[PDB]
Amino acid sequence: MKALTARQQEVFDLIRDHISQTGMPPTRAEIAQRLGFRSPNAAEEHLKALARKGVIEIVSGASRGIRLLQEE
């Protein structure tokens, strides 16, 4: 079940692409640099809506720590 809007679906793919092309999961400023979000306050809104749907787990403490629940 990948039932997502196109801007949320590209934020989910940036979790997989920063792991596969470097090694670490992305911050809200790294989400803003590839997609074009005007500040980290707009990049966090799709990141928390993906967790409310049940597809990604964000750690409360370390800024680069996002485990994907759906897909892998």
Residue ranges of domains in the chain, CATH in brackets? 1-72 (1.10.10.10)
H-helix or E-strand spanning residue 58: strand 56-58
Task: Tell me the two tokens of residue 53.
Answer: 């749907």
Tokens of 22: 């470097």
How far apart are the C-alpha atoms of 10 and 16, rounded to whole Å? Answer: 10
CB 70 within 8 A of CB 55: yes
